């Protein structure tokens, strides 16, 4: 119910002066006189009836003295069951050219976190079909998962295989949010989910909703799409008692986007050129992704590590918010082993003898011990040759090399790259295969038989064919 | 034309206020009431009828309220055929105590670079008599050349050797500009040029002009000398049809002197304390030293690297303005190899089979491959020792160590403090001598016989004496 | 982590004042501070937003004085004052095992010993992974 | 006869190798220390410069 005027335009930060009423912080404003829709968000009160705002789109063509209106509430977006199978914007606008989204409810993207007396204490295992994850770092229902890695190691392929394995066998719904990534991949995912039948253009039996904001957008938009993405999922968790899934691609762009406007807001930089409000801003958002007593949310998040440095302040302050971590490495990928999961740098919270049993626990600890012992023997071999080692050391090295190969596995979404069909392995075969190799029942086979296979039964069938073709 | 008043003096920056007739940028101004001429240059228009200037001399004794007069044009210097054999300074005043310089016309320091349609694209070769340069990274005619090196490694000895070998036989004129160096070296150069005969004091047969501003001058002067040399270099190219050689000593001081005044002008420093405008003002100066459809200019420049660092912002932006590079190393100089030229870090633009011929190119690529291979065995030799290598590796080590010695050479300008005799090798003898070593014809000689000699025939005789 | 910075800056003193009640009445107590680094980060944020001069790694000049006051309130009293006690066990996390950063060097210089834990000893079977070579109590 | 000479030569070789390694690890430490100081000075200058321009 108030009207203002633009008095300054610098970069992506705008200042507005009000003569009648002063809108509160975290309010939405609309500019008058443009062919498209431009929205401003309040950040600070500068005194003398002035505010400093951040734009959600391009700012070219603005003129000092242009009228601005006040909406009177934070950003509101449609929500409900009519947003399944549709693509929407940061501010809730369809971008798939199929007409308006007709719902009955709206929600505000700025809320507050649940309190202490609403948390849940439950832990159950969630099997996926991947040997490394199911052996050394199991996942849990209603938990938080992180996928650390550098550039070009395989985060996106893994997050696609997780969807293909877990999402389709799930009763409930799912949400996917894309933050600061390539548009070309967002064109691929949309047409992949149509062939599989998860998204339907004729019936009303869809199961996924999509929200997108990519790396061609100004920093204002890239720092808000995640809240829009999780506001949708909160509706399916609270207003309906159902389990939900939530996938996020490169949550790192949420933090980088906030460092490109801090200087223009008048702030002194912190270490390595970050804003002084990093941890608080990260904590405010992360606390809303939880499984309260009214519903469950299972989240998978992909995190980018700049220049393969795990001590950087952005990934450093993210380990505390998770329940299970998988770390991808470039050294393993150069040997040709995929997925390039580091076996000595992954952790989980339910790796306890009282939750997964004793056999499963002993097998994993026995694998890790021999993998650690392998490293120390590689210093001796550098100076004195391979043949001067004792026979026990040679047996240790031979077993360790075979253990290393058996952790690789062909995926189903990577048939174009490798050229093989994918495989899925249950948990009991995963335990038994490593227990047998640790025992020493396959000391009469070459290494190549354990490379890119599924269960243990296929390695001997591969070795027999290799013997036949020799 | 108009008069102003001095309002503030800080270091080498002075501000003047004009009642009427505000001067434009790059004009010169004169101070009233001093024994020696003092000139200021306009740099900025602040507002409220005030300007900010830069002085070209010391500013001690100035008082607020003093009078400043306007001239109406940029700095002008005498240019023509009567500057040969004389010595000038920043603002074109003679410092050789021989009277005024009587030329017909004058020229302004600041101008603009040649346009795109005036460029020439011919390429040839220039022979220097030095084995490393001719074999690995040959020079060219009408091109730019740079010499990189730290402190105490020998840039100016090489510049004087190049002067001695090339300048004397040249038919055209030459210009030497000295920026930020020692004065005694300039005095030595003047006296030895008098003795040789390049400078003649009793007639009009001189073929060199000298411009100097040394390291005892305020930073305002040292930021402007190179353009004073450039102007007299360009006159002989445009008005007359001549080939000109231009030697500039430590063009790095042109950049350093510009950052001593950037803070006083009120700017935000960019990186390692340098001024934000570092590449544009270097590009403005460098683009004028070119070859056009009216003449040719050959440039030889010496460059300095602070704290033996090649990634410093100052010498890392000069690589893009050169056609041939020569990099000097302190580690090679420690081993006693002179000149200390790094053979795996020097390039040239005309090293291709269709210009220098097939045989020369094959020999150069073979010697570079042999040199590269020996560098990859250093870690094993430094710990385990020579005995762990096979026979072929020992053979490659011996041949590379023999090749390294043969690249050194004695200079004539260093005979006074080395007790040797200067040498000058033709190109064919170098090509053949390196072919013969690559073929293994001299595997029965000690490696100490290829040290500080000229043509290959001197190695066998020194080996024969050293039985 | 969802609370404001001043609460995360006030939390340890409030817990020390509760334990000082037992020390003055002839009883014994024990207090554990988890993640003393995050209190220093919370304190740095306010000082950067209040326009105070920064220093090494953007920390203020009185960060040592912030932690020296807290850890000097653990003591053993004699018989005239009752004979109480108070013991503290602060915790600090390092990056890549670097013990020459700004905050660990401050905290190491105040206390009376350290217990060093490593990850190489964790995966070769030595659990708990205590390194006896670099541990001491004066 | 041959075995004893082989052993007595291997001992000397293994002594000289450790001498060379001890020689290398002494220059690398000084280089490391200089770089460590330079990084701190460079990262402090940026904070000061970005605080002054406000």
């Amino acid at each position: 119910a108030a009207t203002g005027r633009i008095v300054a335009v610098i970069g992506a930060v705008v200042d507005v002066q009000f003569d009648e009423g002063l809108p509160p912080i975290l309010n939405a404003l609309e500019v008058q006189g443009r062919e498209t829709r431009l929205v401003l968000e309040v950040a600070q009160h500068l005194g003398e009836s002035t505010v400093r705002t951040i734009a959600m789109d391009g700012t070219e063509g603005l003129v000092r003295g242009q009228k601005v209106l006040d909406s009177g509430a934070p950003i509101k977006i449609p929500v409900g069951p009519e947003t399944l199978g549709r693509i929407m914007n940061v501010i809730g606008e369809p971008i798939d050219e199929r007409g308006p989204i007709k719902t009955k409810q709206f929600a505000a993207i700025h809320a507050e976190a649940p309190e202490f007396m609403e948390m849940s204490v439950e832990q159950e295992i969630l099997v996926t079909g991947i040997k490394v994850v199911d052996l050394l770092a199991p996942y849990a229902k209603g938990g938080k998962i992180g996928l650390f890695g550098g550039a070009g190691v395989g985060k996106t392929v893994l997050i696609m295989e997780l969807i293909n394995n877990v999402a389709k066998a799930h009763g409930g719904y799912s949400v996917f949010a894309g933050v600061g990534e390539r548009t070309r991949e967002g064109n691929d995912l949309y047409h992949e989910m149509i062939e599989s039948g998860v998204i339907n253009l004729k019936d009303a039996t869809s199961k996924v909703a999509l929200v997108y904001g990519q790396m061609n957008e100004p920093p204002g938009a890239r720092a808000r799409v995640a809240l829009t993405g999780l506001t949708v999922a909160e509706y399916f968790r609270d207003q309906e008692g159902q389990d939900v899934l939530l996938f996020i691609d490169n949550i790192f762009r949420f933090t980088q986007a906030g460092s490109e406007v801090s200087a223009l807001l008048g702030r002194i930089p912190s270490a390595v050129g970050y804003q002084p409000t990093l941890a608080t801003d990260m904590g405010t958002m992360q606390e809303r992704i939880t499984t309260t007593k009214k519903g469950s949310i299972t989240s998978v998040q992909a995190i980018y590590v700049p220049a393969d440095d795990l001590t950087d302040p952005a990934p450093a302050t993210t380990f505390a918010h998770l329940d299970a971590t998988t770390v991808l490495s470039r050294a393993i990928a150069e040997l040709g082993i995929y997925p390039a999961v580091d076996p000595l740098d992954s952790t989980s919270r339910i790796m306890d003898p009282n939750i997964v049993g004793s056999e499963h626990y002993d097998v994993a600890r026995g694998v890790q011990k021999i993998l650690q012992d392998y490293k120390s023997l590689q210093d001796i071999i550098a100076i004195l040759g391979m043949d001067e080692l004792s026979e026990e050391d040679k047996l240790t090295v031979s077993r360790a090399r075979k253990i290393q190969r058996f952790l690789s596995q062909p995926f189903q979404v990577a048939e174009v790259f490798t050229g093989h069909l994918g495989k899925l392995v249950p948990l009991k075969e995963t335990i038994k295969g490593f227990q047998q190799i640790l025992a020493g029942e396959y000391d009469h086979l070459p290494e190549q038989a354990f490379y890119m296979v599924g269960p243990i039964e296929e390695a001997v069938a591969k070795a027999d064919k290799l013997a036949e073709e020799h | 034309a108009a008069t102003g008043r001095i309002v503030a003096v800080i270091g080498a920056v002075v501000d003047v206020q004009f009642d009427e007739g505000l001067p434009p940028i790059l004009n010169a101004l004169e101070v009233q009431g001093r024994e020696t001429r003092l000139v200021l240059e306009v740099a900025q228009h602040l507002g409220e009828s005030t300007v900010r200037t830069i002085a070209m001399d010391g500013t001690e004794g100035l008082v607020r309220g003093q009078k400043v007069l306007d001239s109406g044009a940029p700095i002008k210097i005498p240019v023509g055929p009567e500057t040969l054999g004389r010595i000038m300074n920043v603002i074109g005043e003679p410092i050789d105590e021989r009277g005024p310089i009587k030329t017909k016309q004058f020229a302004a320091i600041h101008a603009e670079a040649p346009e795109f349609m005036e460029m020439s694209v011919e390429q040839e070769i220039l022979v220097t008599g030095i084995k490393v340069v001719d074999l690995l990274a040959p020079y060219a005619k009408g091109g730019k050349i740079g010499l990189f090196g730290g402190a105490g490694v020998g840039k100016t000895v090489l510049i004087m050797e190049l002067i001695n070998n090339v300048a004397k036989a040249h038919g055209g004129y030459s210009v030497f500009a000295g920026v930020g160096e020692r004065t005694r070296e300039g005095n030595d150069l003047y006296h030895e040029m008098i003795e040789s005969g390049v400078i003649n004091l009793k007639d009009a047969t001189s073929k060199v002009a000298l411009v100097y501003g040394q390291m005892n001058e305020p930073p305002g002067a040292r930021a402007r000398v190179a353009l004073t040399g450039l102007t007299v270099a360009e006159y002989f190219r445009d008005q007359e049809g001549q080939d000109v050689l231009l030697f500039i000593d430590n063009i790095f001081r042109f950049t350093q002197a510009g950052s001593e005044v950037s803070a006083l002008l009120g700017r935000i420093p960019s990186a390692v304390g340098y001024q934000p405008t570092l590449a544009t003002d270097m590009g403005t100066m460098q683009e004028r030293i070119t070859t056009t459809k009216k003449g040719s200019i050959t440039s030889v420049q010496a460059i300095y690297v602070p704290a033996d660092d090649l990634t410093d912002p100052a010498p890392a932006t000069t690589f893009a303005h050169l056609d041939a590079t020569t990099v000097l190393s302190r580690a090679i100089a420690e081993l006693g190899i002179y000149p200390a030229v790094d053979p795996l870090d020097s390039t040239s633009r005309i090293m291709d089979p269709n210009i220098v011929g097939s045989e020369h190119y094959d020999v150069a690529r073979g010697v570079q491959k042999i040199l590269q291979d020996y560098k990859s065995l250093q870690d094993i030799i430094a710990i385990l020792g020579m005995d762990e290598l096979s026979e072929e590796d020992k053979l490659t080590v011996s041949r590379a160590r023999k090749i390294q010695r043969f690249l050194s050479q004695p200079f004539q300008v260093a005979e006074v403090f080395t007790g040797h005799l200067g040498k000058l090798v033709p190109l064919k003898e170098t090509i053949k001598g390196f072919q013969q070593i690559l073929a293994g014809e001299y595997d029965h000689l000690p490696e100490q016989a290829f040290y500080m000699v000229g043509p290959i025939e001197e190695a066998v005789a020194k080996a024969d004496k050293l039985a | 982590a969802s609370d404001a910075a001043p609460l995360q800056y006030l939390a340890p003193y409030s817990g020390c004042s509760m334990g000082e009640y037992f020390r003055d009445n002839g009883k014994h107590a024990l207090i554990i501070y988890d993640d003393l680094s995050k209190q220093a980060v919370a304190y740095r944020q306010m000082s950067l937003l209040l326009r105070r001069p920064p220093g090494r790694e953007a920390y203020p000049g009185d960060v040592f004085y912030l932690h020296s006051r807290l850890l000097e309130r653990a003591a053993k009293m004699n018989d005239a004052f009752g004979g109480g006690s108070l013991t503290a066990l602060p915790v600090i996390e390092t990056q890549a095992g670097d013990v020459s950063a700004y905050i660990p060097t401050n905290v190491i210089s105040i206390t009376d010993g350290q217990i060093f834990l490593e990850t190489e000893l964790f995966y070769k079977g030595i659990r708990p992974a205590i390194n006896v070579g670099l541990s001491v109590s004066r | 006869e041959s075995t004893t000479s082989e052993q007595s030569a291997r001992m000397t070789a293994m002594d000289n190798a450790s001498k060379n390694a001890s020689e290398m690890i002494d220059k690398l430490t000084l280089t490391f220390n200089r770089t460590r100081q330079a990084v701190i000075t460079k990262e402090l200058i940026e904070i000061i410069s970005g605080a002054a321009a406000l």
């Binding site: 650690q372 490293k375 120390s376 590689q378 210093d379 071999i381 550098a382 040759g385 391979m386 | 990859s376 870690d379 094993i380 | 095992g97 013990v99 020459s100 060093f116 190489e120 670099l134 | 430490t29 490391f32």
Partner: peptide, 25 residues
């Protein structure tokens, strides 16, 4: 504690001559 302390597998992490020599054997 203040100095540089090495660990296990540091020879093959630097990727010098000795690492590749170790791998090929």
């Amino acid at each position: 504690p203040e100095g540089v302390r090495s660990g296990a597998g540091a020879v093959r992490d630097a990727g010098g001559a000795f690492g590749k020599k170790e791998q090929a054997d």
